[PDB]
Curated annotation (Swiss-Prot):
Cellular compartment(s): Nucleus; Cytoplasm; Synapse
Name of the protein in its database record: Phospholipase A-2-activating protein
Complete-protein stretch covered: 386 to 465 of 795
Species whose genome carries this gene: Homo sapiens
Transmembrane residue ranges: none
Disease: Neurodevelopmental disorder with progressive microcephaly, spasticity, and brain anomalies: An autosomal recessive neurodevelopmental disorder characterized by progressive microcephaly, spastic quadriparesis, global developmental delay, profound intellectual disability and severely impaired or absent motor function. More variable features include seizures and optic atrophy.
Physiological role: Plays a role in protein ubiquitination, sorting and degradation through its association with VCP. Involved in ubiquitin-mediated membrane proteins trafficking to late endosomes in an ESCRT-dependent manner, and hence plays a role in synaptic vesicle recycling. May play a role in macroautophagy, regulating for instance the clearance of damaged lysosomes. Plays a role in cerebellar Purkinje cell development.
Family classification: Belongs to the WD repeat PLAP family.
């Protein structure tokens, strides 16, 4: 596990591969979505959703961002 430990994200005191930082409420706790790059979007997102007690409506949003991290259409790309 963790052959490379370069970019890890801290959430509530724990470190994960890539946790996402979610803003939507102004003034209050920030939402962090801890994703391991070998885990499924809908699962990882569901994990945080049930963990922080969020609405199932959020699951697609968080999961899709998860995907793009390893996909590359929104922030990935890497194009000429």
């Amino acid at each position: 596990a963790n052959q490379q430990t370069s970019g890890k994200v801290l959430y509530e005191g724990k470190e994960f591969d890539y946790v996402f930082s979610i803003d939507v409420n102004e003034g209050g706790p920030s939402y962090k979505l801890p994703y391991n790059t070998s885990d499924d979007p809908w699962l990882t997102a569901y994990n945080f959703l049930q963990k922080n007690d969020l609405n199932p409506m959020f699951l697609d949003q968080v999961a899709k961002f998860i995907i793009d991290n390893t996909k590359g259409q929104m922030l990935g790309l890497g194009n000429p």
